[PDB]
Amino acid sequence: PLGSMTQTFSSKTEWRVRAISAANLHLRTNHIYVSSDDIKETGYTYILPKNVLKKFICISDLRAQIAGYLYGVSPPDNPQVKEIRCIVMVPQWGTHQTVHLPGQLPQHEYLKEMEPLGWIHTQPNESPQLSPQDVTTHAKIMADNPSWDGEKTIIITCSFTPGSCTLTAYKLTPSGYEWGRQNTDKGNNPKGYLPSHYERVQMLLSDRFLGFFMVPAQSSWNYNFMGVRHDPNMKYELQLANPKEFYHEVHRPSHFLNFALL
Amino acid sequence: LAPRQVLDLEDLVFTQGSHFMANKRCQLPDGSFRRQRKGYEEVHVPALKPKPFGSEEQLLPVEKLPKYAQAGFEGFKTLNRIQSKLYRAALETDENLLLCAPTGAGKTNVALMCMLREIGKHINMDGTINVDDFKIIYIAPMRSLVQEMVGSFGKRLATYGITVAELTGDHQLCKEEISATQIIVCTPEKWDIITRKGGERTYTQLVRLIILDEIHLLHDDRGPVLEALVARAIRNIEMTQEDVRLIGLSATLPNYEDVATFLRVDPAKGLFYFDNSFRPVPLEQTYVGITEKKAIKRFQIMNEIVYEKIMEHAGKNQVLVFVHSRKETGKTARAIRDMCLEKDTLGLFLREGSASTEVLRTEAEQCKNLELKDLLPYGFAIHHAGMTRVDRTLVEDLFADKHIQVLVSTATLAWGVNLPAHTVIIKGTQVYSPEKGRWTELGALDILQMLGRAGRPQYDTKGEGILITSHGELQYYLSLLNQQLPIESQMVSKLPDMLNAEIVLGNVQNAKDAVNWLGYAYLYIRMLRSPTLYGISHDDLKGDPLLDQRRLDLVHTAALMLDKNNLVKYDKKTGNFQVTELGRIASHYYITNDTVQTYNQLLKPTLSEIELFRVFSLSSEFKNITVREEEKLELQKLLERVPIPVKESIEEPSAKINVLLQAFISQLKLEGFALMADMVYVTQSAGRLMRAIFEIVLNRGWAQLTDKTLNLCKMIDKRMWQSMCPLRQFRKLPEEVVKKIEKKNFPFERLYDLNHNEIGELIRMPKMGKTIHKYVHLFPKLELSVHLQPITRSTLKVELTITPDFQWDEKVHGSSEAFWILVEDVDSEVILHHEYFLLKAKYAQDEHLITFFVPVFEPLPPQYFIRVVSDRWLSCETQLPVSFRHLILPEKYPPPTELLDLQPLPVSALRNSAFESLYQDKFPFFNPIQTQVFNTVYNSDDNVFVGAPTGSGKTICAEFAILRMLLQSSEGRCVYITPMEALAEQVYMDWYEKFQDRLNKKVVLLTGETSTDLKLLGKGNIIISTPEKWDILSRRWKQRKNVQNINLFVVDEVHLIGGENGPVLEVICSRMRYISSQIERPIRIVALSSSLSNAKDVAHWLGCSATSTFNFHPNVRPVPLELHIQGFNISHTQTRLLSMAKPVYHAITKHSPKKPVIVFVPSRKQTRLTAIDILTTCAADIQRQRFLHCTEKDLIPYLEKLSDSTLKETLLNGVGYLHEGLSPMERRLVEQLFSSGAIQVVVASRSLCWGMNVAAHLVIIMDTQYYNGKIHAYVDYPIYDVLQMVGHANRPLQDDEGRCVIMCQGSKKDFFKKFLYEPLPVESHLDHCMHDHFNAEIVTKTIENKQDAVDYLTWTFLYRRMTQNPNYYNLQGISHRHLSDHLSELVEQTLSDLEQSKCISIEDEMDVAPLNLGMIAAYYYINYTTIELFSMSLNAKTKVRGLIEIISNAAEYENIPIRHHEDNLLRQLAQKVPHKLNNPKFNDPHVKTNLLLQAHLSRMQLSAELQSDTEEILSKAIRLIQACVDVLSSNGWLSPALAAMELAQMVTQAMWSKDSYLKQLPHFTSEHIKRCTDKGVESVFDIMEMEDEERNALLQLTDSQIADVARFCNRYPNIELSYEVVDKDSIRSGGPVVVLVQLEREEEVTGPVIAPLFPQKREEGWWVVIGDAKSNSLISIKRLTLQQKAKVKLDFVAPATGAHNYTLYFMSDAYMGCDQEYKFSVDVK
Ligand SMILES: Nc1ncnc2c1ncn2[C@@H]1O[C@H](COP(=O)(O)OP(=O)(O)OP(O)(O)=S)[C@@H](O)[C@H]1O
C-alpha cells in the first residue's frame, strides 16, 4: 500500500558492470587452455601465436561476441601445418550468440602474400558443439568468397570459462557448407543442423613466432555502441596497428557527449 | 645515534594552524571597553597615539639618498618613520634585516632600498646594469599580491631597464623562468618547487638577495615552506661560501627575536621592531562576538549588526565589508540594502541631486553586468575574481573617487589592489577549507591585510576596523591585532615531505646531515627558547642542551615513515639515506609521501581507465574530504551517468572525488557550496598529481598506461573528453558549431583532404568556410619518415625524420610546441625507447632528425611502432608503423683469430743489441699478442692488421714494423697516424726517447701548420700526425716527392673510422693504397685497431692477406678484464649522479681497497664534487686519509704548487682530480703522484680520457652521458670513448687482473653489454663528407670525369660495407648495378653541389675540371661551404675590418660553444674593441669569434678557457687569411689583398696596423713606447743601432730580458731587395713583361718565427706584389719561402702605352714593420 508512500528511481546501465568486468580480462590471458580430448583430427595443423591471442581476449567482452579474420602462412617446405600470422579486426557489432561482420573481406597489400584461414570469435559459454549460427556464418562467407576453402578455413571459439580461457577450433564439412548457406533460421536448434556439419581441427598455441594486428584506417572495430552506424554493405580500408580495448573512449562517444550537458 | 625513539608527529602538530593561540592571556591597551548587547558582545579598542619622535629621528628626504638610488624613488619626497631609520642598514649595509611593523607602515620601500643596493653593485660605466650578474627573489604570500608588485616594481625600476615578471608557472621545458628577468616575484611554494629541481644549470647561482615578505606566515600552515626555503639557502651558503642577503618583513607579533635568529639577523644591527604606534593612520578597533549558536538566527543577528554599523557611517564615511565567498558578496550587499528601503534609510548615501549619483547611474548602464547593475545606482557595489576585470577597475575607480558608499568584496581585493576605506567591516570570520574538509576560521594574514585597509592615508584622520565573529574567538583576534599572537612553527606536520626534498637534492645524505639541516629550521629556534611549548620538558632540555637527541628522534621518525612508503632507503645502523626515483617524483611534483606509496601499490601496466580514476581519488591530499548527506542525491544523479564507471559506492569519499573530476572535464556546474569548492580543490591539484603518475609509468615502459595518463593530463587541462572534436581546443570559436560537427559522425583525420568549399557542405554550414579550413591546418600535425640502419643482428639504429605538416601561429602555438617520441614494440605493450622532442617556432618549417637504438631478436618481429604524441593538444598523434619484413640484417661476424698457446717470445728474437736496449729493462718477454704477430711484422713486408683490445700492447707491434724499416734502409721514412692529438703527443714523447735518444733516428710531430709539416717530413724518419694534419699534405702527393716515397705507413686506432671525424681517417689510408697502386715498390701499411666484428673488411680494404689478418676479440686481453655494469633507475641526471655517489666508494673498497683507482665523471665541476664526496664518505667510516699511502709531508714539495683551493685539501687525504680547467702545471703533478702510489684515487673528467699518462687497477665510469651547451641536451658517451676509459684499467707488471665498474642508466645497460664483451662493428660515414675530398681529387686531377669519381669510391671502406650492410646506407640490394645507381647518385649530387658553389666545372655532364676557387679550398684544407661564402663577401674596398667578419662566418668556427654565462662580458667587449659591429646580437658562434679575435689582437687577457678557445681559433685563422689573399688577388684587388697580408702578421704577433711596431720585442711593457717621441725611436732596427754602452740603461730590464731582446732582433727579418725590369725598351703593349726580384736575407737565422702569443710555430712567408696603387689593381703576386738565396719572376702583360708607374710590394705574414715598397716606371710602346 502506497498509503505510506513510494520511492524514486535511479538508472543503471548494463555496460557499467560489464566495463568493470572487461577491465580484468588480462587475468585470463595467463590460463589459456586448448582442447585435445579424443576428437581424432582432420589435417592441417593450425598454430596460433599467443601475443595476438592475449590481445584478442583483453579487447573482448564477457557477453558481447567479437570476431577477427585469420590470415596466415605455412613454413617453407612443410605444408602440413598452418601458422596464423595476423588477425584483422573489422567494423562489427555482436550479441551473446553471433557476430555481425560486413560483406567485404579484408583487402590489403600486407595480406596479399598470405592465405585466409577462417576467423576467430569469443563465446560467452563453452559449448560441446560448434554453434549452429557459426555454420551459417562460415558457409555464407564461403558462398560469397571463393578464396575461403572448405578444408583450409576454420572457426576458433574462445569460450569464456570461469577464470580461464579454453580454445576450440572446428572446420566445416561439405554437409555443413551446404546447409549453412541454406539457413534462414537464427535459432539455436534450427533445421537441417546436425553434428555432421563440422569436425574439430588441431590447434597449438606457441611462442616460436609473433603475429600482428590490422585495424581499419579511419575507423574502429567496435561498433556495439553505434550499431545504427553499422550496415552490412559498408566498405573499409585497413592499417597496420593494434586494436583498442572494447570500452575505449573512441568506441562510445555518446557516453561522453551526453554527459557534457546536465 | 644509539637509543633513539620513534615519535608520533601528529601528536606534536598544532592542529589549528595559523589559528593556534600560544599566548594564554591577553592585555588590551588603556581605554579599552566592552559592552554586552543583543545576545552578543562588543569589544572596543581605542586608537593608539603616535609615539613622540625619538632622539636623532628626523624624516630623511630622498635628496639625501645615494644618487643612484633616487631613480627608484622618483615620485617620493621624504621617507616615513620606519624607512628613514632603515635606509642606512638597507643601502649602505649587507646585513640580514628583519623589519617589524603594522601593515601599512611602508615596509615595502625598505625592501626596495635592499634591492637598490644589490642592483647598484652590478651597474657598469655604460649607464646600464650587467643584468647577467645578479638576480633578486621577492617572496610574497598571495599570488594576487605577486601580480600587483610585479607591475609596481617594474615601473619604479623601469628607468634602470630591468625585467620584473611573475613566473610563467607552466614550463619545465624552455624554462625561460628567468635569464631575461632579474627580480622574480613568487610565492613560497613556487620558489621551493624550483629549488627542489636538481641540475644547477638553473639560475639560482645568481641569487644574491631574497625578500621574504609577510614572514609572519611561519605561524600559518604554509609556514613550513618558508622554513624549507630559508634552511636550504642558508645551508647552501656554508658549502659555496657565496653570501646571500636575507630580508624579512613581518607584522608586529611576538617571537620576532626568534625569527631574527632564524634569518641569521644580528639583534644589534638588523633587528627593527616598531609597535602599532607606527601605523600611519590611527585605527579604532571594534570586535563583535556572537554568543548565539543557532544556524540561521546567528545569520540574522549578523545581518542586524552589519546594518546598524553601516548606519553609523552612512553618508559620512565609506564602508568596505569583507565576506568570504564570491556569492555572499551579492547576497550581503542586497541584504544591507533591502533592509534600508524597509526603513527608508538611503537619502544618507546620496544627496539631493548629488554630483556623484549622476555618474553612478550613467555607468551602471555601461556596466552590462546584471549583479552590479542593481546595486550601483543606490551607491553599492561588489567585487570578486569571478566577474570581468573591466568591472573590477570600474568598481575600484568609482570607490577611489568617493562615489560608492558601500563595497562588499572578498579577500582578493585586499591583496590585489591598494584600495583603502575609512570603515572596514569583516562580516564573519569563518570560511570553508576543502583541504581540511570543514569550516575553518580565517587565516591570520587575511585578517591583518583586510583590517590594514581601514583608514585612507591622507583623507582620513583615523580608521574604523570592525570585526564580527563568534564570541569564542574574540581572544584570538584581540591578540593577533594587538601584537600578542606569537609566531610559532607548524613544520612537524610536513617534516617527512621536507626531509625527502633535501634527500633528493643531495643536501642531506645521512641522519647527521638532517640534524644539521634541522638546526636551520625555525622549529629548532622555537624549540630552544620555548622547548616546553613543543612537547619537550625543561628537564630533558638541559640533559640535551642543543637538542641533539630530540632532533635525532624527529629525523629518525621522519626517515622511517619515508622508508615505509618506499621513497627513501634508510640504513638505521649508518643513518644513511638512499634516494629513489619514487622519492624524487614526490618532491619534484609536490606530492606528499603517503600518496606516492598508494601510487606504488596500485599502479599496474594492465590498469584500466576505471581503476586509474580510482587511484587518483585515493590521493592523500583528499584525506579530509567526506560525503555530506545533503550532497548524496546530486552526486547520485551523476554517478549513474558518468562515462567512466565507478566501482565503489556513494557512501565512501573515494567515489565522490571520482565524480567531481569527471564532471569538471565535462564542464558541468554543480550546486553544493562545499561541493563546487571541493571540486575546484580536487582539480586544481589534479594537474600535478596526474603529471606525476604519467612520469612514473612512462619511465617504467608501460605503453598502454602512459597513453591513458598523458591523455588524462590533457583532458583535465583542456576540460574536454577525447570523444569531442579536437577543434574546441581553439578558444576563438563559437561552441555550438563544433557540436554540430561532432554529432555528424565522421573522423577528424578526414578534413585535411578537402577544400574549404566541401567543409561547409558536410557540416551543412557554408556560412563560414575558410575559418574551419584555417583552424584545421593550425592544429599541430607531423609526418614521420624513417631510415633503418641495422648495426647488428641484435642491435638496430633508427633515424627518425620529423616533418611538420601544419601552419604555425604564435597566437595559438606560442614560442614552442612539445611532443613525446614513443617507440613501442609489437603488441603496443612495452616502450622500447622514449625521448623528448620539442619543436620551437624558430625551426617550425624544417625537418628534424632523431637517432636512437632499439633491441631486436632474430625471430624478426612483425613491426615496431613509433608514436609522436603532443604534450598539450588532445587527439594530436601520429603513429608510424615500422615493419621489418624487408629489412636486410648483416651477417654474423666471423669467429676471432684463435690466440695460439705460443711460447713466450723474449726480446732475444730481435737479434740486434741496439734494438734490444729499448725493451730488455722494461719487461723480459712480450705478451702473447705481441708474439704471434712478430714473425709477420718483423720478418715480413706484407700489410698487417692487428685487432686487439685497448691495452694489449699494440703500440709495440707498430714498433716492430718500424724497427724493420731501419734495417732495410737506415734513411727510411715512416708516417704514424693516430686519430687524437692527445694520443699523438704521448706517442711522440715515447718514440722520441726510444728512436732519437737511443737510436738517433729523427722523429717529429706534425703541427697542423703547413708552414712546418713539410719540413719535418724531409728530415724526419718517424712522422707522427693526426688525420687532418696528414690529409692536407698527402693531397698533393703527385707533386710532393716526400709523400709518395715513405717506406711504412702505420694507422692506429683505425676502429674510429665510424666515429665523428672517421671519414678523414678513411680518406688518407684509402689514398695511401691508391698512391702505392699508382707507383712502383708498394708502401707497407700496418693497421692497429680495437677488436672489430668486421675486421676482415678493414683487412681487405687495406690489402691485408688472411694470413696477415690478426682479428682478436676482447677475450684475449693480456691482463684479464673483470667488467661490471650497474644500472640505475633514476631518469633525472643530477639525481642519478647522487644515487651512484656512495656506490662509487663501495666499489673502491670492494674491488680495489689498496691499489690505485681512476673515476671518470661527465663534467669538470663533478671532478671536485665527487673527490669531496669520496673523502667525507671515507671519513664517515672513520678511515680518513686511507687513500694516502704516503706520509703527510713527503708531498708538500709537490702539494703547494697548485692554484686550486680544494685540490690541495683533497690531495692531502690521498684523492686528486684532473680536468681541463686545471693547469698543465697542475695535471702533470697529480699524474705523477698517482703513479707514485702516494694517492690512491683520482677523479678525471670525460674530456681527459684520451690525454692521460696514468693507469690504475680499478676504473669507475660514473654515468655515461654529458650535457652539451649548444643543443642544451644530454649526449651519450661515444662507444669509442667508453672503450678508451676501460682500457686505463690495465697494469701488466703490477696486477694479476683489471677491474672496471660502469654505472649507467638502466636503459643503456643492455647496450654496453653487447658492445663491450664482443668486438665492435664499425661502418663508414664518408657518404656524408664527400664534397671536400671530391674537390681535392678534382684539383689534383685524380678525378677528371664522372666515371673517375665512381672509380675513386671503390678504393674506400665505404664501398665494401655497402655489400655487407646495404640497409645502413639506404640500399635495398647488394646486386652489382644496385651499387652503381647508388654510387652514381652520390657522385652526381656531390659534383652538382660543387658546381653550384663555383668550385668545379661540369662539361657535357661527364667531364669535370677544377676552378681557381676550388684550388684554393683544396690547397688550404678549407670547406667548400666556407670558400663559397668568402667569394660573395670579399669586395674591392674590403679592409682589415671587413676581413675579420668574413673569416668569422667560417664553417670551421661554428663548432665551439656559445656560453651565455658570459654574454654581457662579450657585450662590453663589443665596446672594448677598436672596431664596432653592425646589428650585433650575441647568440651566434661567428660573432663570438669576431670579438675573440679582436680581443687577441689587442692582447686582452681573458678567461682560462676562452684563452684556450682562441688557441684553436688561431690554429685555423692563418689558412683562412691566406685563402682571402688568394681570392682578393685573383680578382685584381690591391688594397684588400695587402690589408689581408697585414692581417696575417697582425694575427701572428697580436697587434694592429695602428699600434707601435716595437710591440713585438719581448718583455717590453704595455705603454713602453711613450718613450720614443721623447727619444726619437720608431722602427725595430733603431734598437740594434742604439749604442750598447747606453742601451744598457733606458729599457730598465733584467739582463735576462735584454738577452731575449737580442734573440728577437737577431732573427728579426730584414732583407736586401734587388729588382730589375727585363728589356726596359723592348716592351710592346700586349707583350710579355717580367720583373726579376732577388732576395738575400742579410743575415743567418736559426729556428722559426718568434711569436710567443701564437700557438703554432710558423715559418717566414713572403709575398711579392706588383700593382698600381692609384688604380687599386693587383698585377702580379707570388708566394715564396726565403732561406738565404731566392729569386722571383713576376710576368704580366702590358696595357696601353704611356708611362704606367707600378708598385713593388714585399709583404710578410709573421712580422710587422718589414714591408718594403719600391716604385718604378715602365716606358711602354
Ligand atoms: N615614504 C612614504 N611617504 C609617503 N607614503 C608612503 C611612503 N612609503 C610608502 N608610502 C605608501 O604607504 C602605503 C602602504 O605601504 P606598504 O609598504 O604597502 O605597507 P606594508 O604593509 O608595510 O608593506 P607589505 O605588507 O609588504 S604590502 C602605500 O600606499 C605607500 O605607497
Ligand SMILES: [Mg+2]
Ligand atoms: Mg608586508
Ligand SMILES: [Mg+2]
Ligand atoms: Mg691503438
